[PDB]
Amino acid sequence: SHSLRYFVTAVSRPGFGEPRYMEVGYVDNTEFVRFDSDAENPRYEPRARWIEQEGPEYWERETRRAKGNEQSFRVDLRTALRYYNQSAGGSHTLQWMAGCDVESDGRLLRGYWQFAYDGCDYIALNEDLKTWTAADMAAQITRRKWEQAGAAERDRAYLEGECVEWLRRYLKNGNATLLRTDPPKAHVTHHRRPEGDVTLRCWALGFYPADITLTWQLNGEELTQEMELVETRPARDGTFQKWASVVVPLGKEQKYTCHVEHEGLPEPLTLRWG
């Protein structure tokens, strides 16, 4: 499965100018394009080499789409003040995420097209891609308007058409980058705590794709809530990073072992304090 998703944000700032507007596009867990109204040059920009192969028509077209969206969101921020009857001097946020998850074989799995206002669900297109779920009173007003206007129909056309077709194109043109495999490097580090015991930290870095399994075992038994497992996140070079730590008794670290599983490894990697 693969995905093409766009994360959009509009943040008003009364007294500081027009709302800040941003768009970030991702193929799976990798950003490849972005738009920021506050950038040195406010237009669509590549964020990965493989997308740079797209001609000028692509950048001017996406730039136009982004600026058109920006105007739409400016209007939406004003309307929202009215729906919620809020003061006109405060800052507010409108968020939107749309995209498609496609089956291992160019078959659409799920479509997304949802909004949030001031960090809370506002309205979202249901899985049938034909109906809307409004989270509150105000969103109910938007829903009625979109049903009468036929918004879903056009939105679905994007998800089932453009979103799917372009993702296929992106996966092909960016194959060397998007479908590559960078093996993880792993380490275990040893820090004595002030309380007298020891914190063992298992590192996993420089890997791609993001999916990875990192765990601590005690006497060959996987630990769960007893260890601290942070979520994996990106590094600056397009790879990912993760780590897990466990507090163990001073003198008993030979009993703890860290396990790493990743498609970039030929077999699970087991490490110990060293």
């Binding site: 766009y6 768009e23 596009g25 394009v33 692509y58 077209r61 996406e62 789409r65 982004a66 058109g68 969206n69 739409s72 969101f73 209007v75 939406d76 309307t79 929202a80 729906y83 749309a98 995209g99 097209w113 909004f115 506002y122 309205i123 938007t142 308007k145 979109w146 206007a149 918004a151 056009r154 939105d155 994007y158 453009e162 979103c163 372009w166």
Partner: peptide, 10 residues
């Protein structure tokens, strides 16, 4: 390519 709000405002 990305999604378009078109003219469907909230």
């Amino acid at each position: 390519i990305g999604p378009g709000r078109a003219f469907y405002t909230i």
